[PDB]
Structures are given as structure tokens and as C-alpha cells.
Amino acid sequence: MYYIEELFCRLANGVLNNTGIVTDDRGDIEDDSKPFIIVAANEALTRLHGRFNMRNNNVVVEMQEGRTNYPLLAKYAVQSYDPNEVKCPFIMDLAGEKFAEDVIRILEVYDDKGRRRPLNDRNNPCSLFTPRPNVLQNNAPKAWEVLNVMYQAKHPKLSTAEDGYNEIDIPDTLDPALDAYIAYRYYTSLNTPESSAKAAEYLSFYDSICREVVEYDLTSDTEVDTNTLFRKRGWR
Amino acid sequence: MYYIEELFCRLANGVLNNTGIVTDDRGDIEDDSKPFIIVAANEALTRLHGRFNMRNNNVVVEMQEGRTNYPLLAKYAVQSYDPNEVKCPFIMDLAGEKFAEDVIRILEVYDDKGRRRPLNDRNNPCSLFTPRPNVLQNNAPKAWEVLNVMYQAKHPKLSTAEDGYNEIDIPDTLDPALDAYIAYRYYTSLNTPESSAKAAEYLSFYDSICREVVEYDLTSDTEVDTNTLFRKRGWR
Amino acid sequence: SIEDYLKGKNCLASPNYDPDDQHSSWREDLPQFKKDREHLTLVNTRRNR
Amino acid sequence: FVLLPEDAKKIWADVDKAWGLALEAGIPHIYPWSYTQVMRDGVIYAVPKVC
Amino acid sequence: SGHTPFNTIPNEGYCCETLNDPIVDKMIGNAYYVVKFVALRMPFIKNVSDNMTQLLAIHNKLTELSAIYTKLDELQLIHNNLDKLQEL
Amino acid sequence: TIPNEGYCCETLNDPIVDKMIGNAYYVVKFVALRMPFIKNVSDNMTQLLAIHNKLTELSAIYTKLDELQLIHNNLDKLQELYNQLSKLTGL
Amino acid sequence: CETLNDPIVDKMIGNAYYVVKFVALRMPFIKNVSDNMTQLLAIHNKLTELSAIYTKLDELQLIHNNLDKLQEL
Amino acid sequence: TIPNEGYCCETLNDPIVDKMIGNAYYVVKFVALRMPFIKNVSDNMTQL
Secondary structure (H helix, E strand, O other): OEOHHHHHHHHHHOOOOOOOOEOOOOOOEOHHHHHHHHHHHHHHHHHHHHHHOOEEEEEEEEOOOOOOEOOOOHHHEOOOOOOOOOOOOOEOOOOOOOOOOOEEEEEEEEEOOOOEOOEOOOOOOOOEEOOOOOOOEOOOOOOOOEEEEEEEEOOOOEOOOOOOEOOEOOOHHHHHHHHHHHHHHHHHHOOOHHHHHHHHHHHHHHHHHHHHHHHHOOOOOOOOOOOOHHHHOOOO | OEOHHHHHHHHHOEOEOOOOOEOOOOOOEOHHHHHHHHHHHHHHHHHHHHHHOOEEEEEEEEOOOOOOEEEOOHHHEOOOOOOOOOOOOOEOOOOOOOOOOOEEEEEEEEEOOOOEOOEOOOOOOOOEEOOOOOEEEOOOOOOOOEEEEEEEEOOOOEOOOOOOEOOEOOOHHHHHHHHHHHHHHHHHOOOOHHHHHHHHHHHHHHHHHHHHHHHHOOOOOOOOOOOOHHHHOOOO | OHHHHHOOOOOOOOOOOOOOOOOOOOOOOOOOOOOOOOEEEEOOOOOOO | OOOOHHHHHHHHHHHHHHHHHHHHHOOOOOOOOOHHHHHHHOEEEEOOOOO | OOOOOOOOOOOOOOOOOOOOHHHHHHHOOOOHHHHHHHHHOHHHHHHHHHOHHHHHHOHHHHHHHHHHHOOHHHHHOOHHHHHHHHHO | OOOOOOOOOOOOOOOOOOOOOOOHHHHHHHHHHOHHHHHHHHHOHHHHHHHHHHHHHHHHHHHHHHHHHHHHHHHHHHOOOOHHHHHHHHO | OOOOOOOOOOOOOOHHHHHHHHHHHOHHHHHHHHOOHHHHHHHHHOHHHHHHHHHOOOOOOOOHHHHHHHHHO | OOOOOOOOOOOOOOOOOOHHHOOHHHHHHHHHHOHHHHHHHHHOOOOO
């Protein structure tokens, strides 16, 4: 829940202390070396959010008469659409946030009437398909039809361009994993044998921390639920 | 329970004697290298409190009419909220206890009437969900409804800025683990072949001490309770 | 401080209370006002200044 | 009183204890005995280390 | 482990007790002593509050009462003899 | 039939709610919100005790304010160089 | 099993909660008193004068209008 | 009404409580708190 400047300071004080990237007073990263750190941080956040299933997000898609493929992009969102290019958007962002393009995997799709819609089921005619990992199909659009999509989400892009996201939202147990990944990227990029050995060390540290977090289940990844098939099958 | 200055003088008179950080009298760390030690100490405390399950804390959250998502952040605490940004806070604090974000895992949630609320149960309509590790969901808020959250907590943030927490609360069997972790970080950051060899030793020492403490169960981590399923199942 | 225990009221009910510092039984805090005397020590003369 | 400077440490520790007792009693004014001995033995006053 | 303060009525095994102290400790911590101090001497507060109307009226005349008090010794002035003389 | 009952609407000056007496949390927060009044009472307890002690005397005075109002107005004329009263009795 | 022991001192709901409820049910008195600290401080200030007047309350009335008329008479 | 019995309110000048005589800890602490009186008596035994 801290800004990008705190990340730059924490890198200036932790790993990357001897490196020539850091300013003279050891306060913050030098200006010309910031895009490198931003790219590395984005890659690390995507890796972690793919691994751990932290964020569960929702989006609402409204159905037009002649369209069957509904890609989930920011072009068709209310808060971000360009009136000249797209006449009518089908992704609603009225309340809050801007729906950054962060669709990794689609889990559940529910109709506007409270009825579930099967995904990727060939033998069920009333099913929804995904030709691409974020594109969604419905082959029979109807009037007054709306679908709610529950999907696994990744961290929104960090840009530091006066309009991008400054905030970093990550569990406090996984800061060292992110820092280790950034250090691995840098020391691999240096292209020397000693730096290569240091990069190997940092990558191994990243893996070990992730495996520890998996062992102790600090993100509450495991889920169970009450049995419902006992009654469906007819047992007494 | 001891000050931060005791930690600085223990690191000045224990490990890190032979390094150039310490002052001439070897009684304290120089002003230039205190942020580094603070960052390392916070990382070590997060590691230990994630591993061992020492602290168990509590929050009181009351439910508003139109809210279902209740992030556990200081922006919504009574002592720390901004009146113009947030109309009404929902997390109750005290002037002495201001609720720093220290939520690792949520264990139990209890109603204001003394009845337990199932957590993350898909097949139970009257259950609470956590989309994110620090966010709660209640799909049917009601009048005069308040919830108690029983969660595992981490150590408060050390800042040494006349407003941060100076003290350290840790069992006396795990001081060498913290010192070894700090030394590991410092010796890795040097980027020389000998320093890495020393850092491997320090990290292995930290691991061995943690494993020993688990082996003898000095923190009373193991918990056992009386059997109540004997009566529920109908046995005689 | 056993003598202080003997010659004391030691009654919990008191009229003094600071609203700025209200806490439960959970909170433990060391005071910021450290109390420490100054002792005589000979200068090292090995640590050249 | 510190004569024969090879005996400085023990006598100055005793001076510390005596000053502690005098401060406990409440005497207003306290003197180290001499300028010569103080400058010869390099006596300085500092808070003790916490460890 | 720990006991949730809102976990009142845990009395599954045996009926007695409800365990309501932890909520008091959680919300009114460090300030229970002032509450008890007021509670012990509450009859005095009740008696004082019962006579609020009057105790405000004695106030609406405090300066006048002080001015009258300044002459209390002089007020008596042995009126009997002067009354007898005036009756003539 | 819009509901307005909630913890947000309540302020420190509101009275108690009879239906929520059974709820322990409601009573605890009821006492917690109104700590300024209890602190004001506690700080000035000696004055209240003295007034309670003298209430038996200050209880009567109250019946006699009306007479004292006229007596206070008369006092200025009533001074009359009190030493002259002995001479007037003599004459 | 049961740790209540003496019923006269120990309450089932809880000692602290019992005191808190006792204070809560009698809040109007505390509120009425607290609203008027400024007024009851003046009476405490002038308590000595009020006590002095109380001593002469029984006398010194004398239907004093009768006395002033007698002076006029 | 409001109970005000406890070990904190107890002082060395208070009399014994007949209810807690059976409690061994109460008797032991009652004797322990009032040790100055016993020491004063023992010091001046010849005079007595």
C-alpha cells in the first residue's frame, strides 16, 4: 500500500547498495535507471500474481445485438473509451476504479438472472467459449442480457508518468521475493561471471521464499467447502 | 522487551565488530548506515512472525448500509482517517492503539451476538469471503451489526523517528536468528567472494536455530483441544 | 520498592486519566524519557582521535 | 585521591560509587579533588553502554 | 492462541458465565477506573442532580447574596428600642 | 419505512435505546462515547461533595429569595449611619 | 466447573461489565450534573458566605418591611 | 451494590476478614504484610 518512491528507497538501502545505479547520498535510484527497475518490478508482480492467486476481481459485460466476440480490453470501458472510435462501450466502470487490463484467467460467469453459464463445454449448447485467453464468446446475444465475469487478476501496470499507478499492493511477506527478482534481473544484465553467480543466488532465494510461503499457507490459498453431492446423488 | 538502541549496540558488539559500519568506540552504528539496519530488521521480523505464529491480535469492524468490501487499512480507522476523503470510518481504535496494518492471516470472525461466522465457504449462503488477504466481504449487511476479526499479526514497524515504535517484542530464544539474518543481508550486499561465503554461514545458522526452536517447541506452537465430535456424531 | 508497597494507598480507582493515551491491556510501551546517570570513565588513549 | 597513577582505575571506580551515594543523599555542590590528577588520568563523564 | 472478545456465551460444556469482561477491556481499557470512581460515589451525584433547579436559582442571585452578607452584623441593629421609641 | 437506525447516526448527545440494552457491545460503546461527562464529574468531585454536604443548608435559603430581593434594594437606604440609631433610641 | 464462588461479590455477567451497565443505566444524572460545572463552581466559591447567611436566616427577616415602615412611621 | 473488595484495597491497618480464614494464601499474605509490627515487638522483647 506504499508508493513507488518507497520501493526506490527500499532498493537503494537494501540490495543494489554497492551498484553505481544508486545516487551519491544513497537516497534513491538515479533518474536514467528508473525504467529498468519499473520493467523488472512489473515482471516480478506478474510472476507472483500468476503463482499465488491473490486477487479476485469482477467485471460486468453488456451484450450488443451484432457482436459475438467480447474482448476484455480498456478500449470498451466507460471510463476509458474514445467516443470517436467506439460508439458504445460494453464494460461498465461507473462506481470506481478504471478496469486496468488485468485478466489472467476466467473462473465463473453468471447471468443477470442469477443463473450460472458453463464455460468451454462443447457438449452443452448454452455454454460460453474463449477463443483467446481474454476474449469471450456468446453465440446467441439477446436483448436485455448482461453477464458478470469472475476472473483472476494481476497487478495493474506501474508507469510513473503522472497518469499511471504509483501504488504497489502486495502482501508484506512477499516484498523480499520482489526485491530478489529485481536484483536477479540487474545482476544477470551486468554480463560478468561474478554477477552471474550473484544472480543465481538471488533467483534461488526468490524460489525458496515462495516455497516457504506456500508451505505455511500465509495467503490462505487452500479452500474447502461443505459437501453438496451427498444430497444430489440420493443418499439418506 | 528492549529499545532499538540496545539492538544497535548488540550488533555493534556482537557480529559486525570487524566491519566499517561501527563507530570508533564500537558502541553504536553510524548515522549513515541506520536505514539499512532498520530495513533488514523489519524484513527479519516479518520472516519470523510469518513462520512461528507468535502474536494473535484483534480488530472490531462495524458494518455500514451500502458497503460489502471492508479493506483493513488505516485510511478507515477513526484515529487515522481524513474527514474529507472518508465520510465515516468503520474500524474502531484507541488513542494509544492506532492499528498499524499488521494482518498476515485471518483465523476467526465472530458476530456481535456471540455466534461464529463461516469464512471462505462457497456452499454456505451465510458466510464471509476474503477477495484479498486484507479485505473482507459481507454480502448482506444489517442494522446494528458488528464483527470481530481474530487474525495472526506481525511486529509493528520500527522507524526511530520519535513517532515510530522503538521497542522490540521477541522471545529471547530468537535474538540470534534476527542477528544472523541481518548479518546475512549485510554480507551479501558487499559483492565479494569472501563475503558471500560468510553470508552462507550466517543464513545456515539462522535456519538451524529456527529448526531447533521448532524441535523443542519453545514457543508452545503446538495446540491440542478436547474432543467434542464424540457427542455430535451420536456415540454413547 | 517493597517499602513503597507498604506505605501506599494502592487503590485502583483513581481520578487521574490521560485521554490522549488510552490503551487496552494489550499495549506495552517503553517510555521515551530514559533515565540514566553519568559515570566517570578514563579516556581510552588507544582509540586515537 | 589518586596518587601513584598506576592505581587510577580502582580509585576512580570508588570515586564513582562515592559520587553516587553523595547524589543520593542530595548534596548541592560536589568537587573532584584536583586539576592535576584529573588532567593526568584523563577522566571524562559519559553514560554507560547498554549491553 | 487467543480468545476472541466477541466470543461471549461459549458456555457449551456448562451453562454458567458469559465472559463479558474482554469487550470492556477492549473498548474502555485504561478508563475503567474513572468509571468505577464515579460509580462508587453515585448517590451524591443523584442527590446533587435532583436539586438542580434550586441550585441554579441560588446562583442567579450570588452577587446580591454577597452584598447582603457584607452587612449581616449591621442588619440586626437592635430594632426593638427604636421601634418602641417610634411608636410614641 | 426507510430505516434510520445505525451506529453512524448516533452522537454523544443522544439518549439510550431501550431495545439494545441486552446487547453488551451497545452498552459498552454507549459508556465509551460519553467519557467527557464522566471525566468532568470526576475532576470536580470535591466541589460536588462540599455542595452535597451543604445542600441541607442551601435547601432552605431557596424559599427566601423573594424577600431578599426587596431587602437588598432597601439596604442602600437602610444604612442610615447605623451609629445614629443609638441616638435615635436615646431621643 | 463453577468459579463464581461467593454470589455477593461475584457477578455472572462480569464485574467490570456490571459496573459499566450500572453507570450506563444512570447516565442522565451525570449528564445534567456535567452540563453545569460552571454554575456549581460559583456556589462552591461562595459556600462560606451562604453558610454565614444561613445562620442569620432564622433572625434578620422580622418582616423587615415592618421595620422600614416603622422608621418611616 | 458495587463491590469494592480486593487485595489492592487492603491495607496493613485493616482488620482480618472472617470469610477468607480458610484460604491459606490469604492468611499467609496477611501475616506477611504486617511484618513491621512483629519486627518491632521482637526487637524490644527485653523491655516488654
